[PDB]
Amino acid sequence: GSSGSSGTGEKPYKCEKCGKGYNSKFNLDMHQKVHTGERPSGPSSG
């Protein structure tokens, strides 16, 4: 029926903003400073 990749690695940090995983609490930080711009779309939590 259906099948795909399970995810051997572990992504304890995800970026819902875009949808990418990060295996580093530090790396994600620098990345978090990317979706700052106030997109034309309404937020979700502030």
Residues that bind Zn ion in the complex, under the rule CB under 5 A: 15, 17-18
**Cα distances (angstroms) measured from residue 43 to each of 12, 36, 46:** 23, 11, 7
Which residue, judged by CB position, is nearest to Zn ion in the bound state?
15
CB of 26 to Zn ion, least distance (A): 15
Residue number, 2 or 18, with CB nearest to Zn ion? 18
Residue number, 18 or 40, with CB nearest to Zn ion? 18
Can you say how many angstroms the Cα of residue 18 is from the centroid of all Cα atoms in its chain?
5
Residue number, 2 or 36, with CB nearest to Zn ion? 36
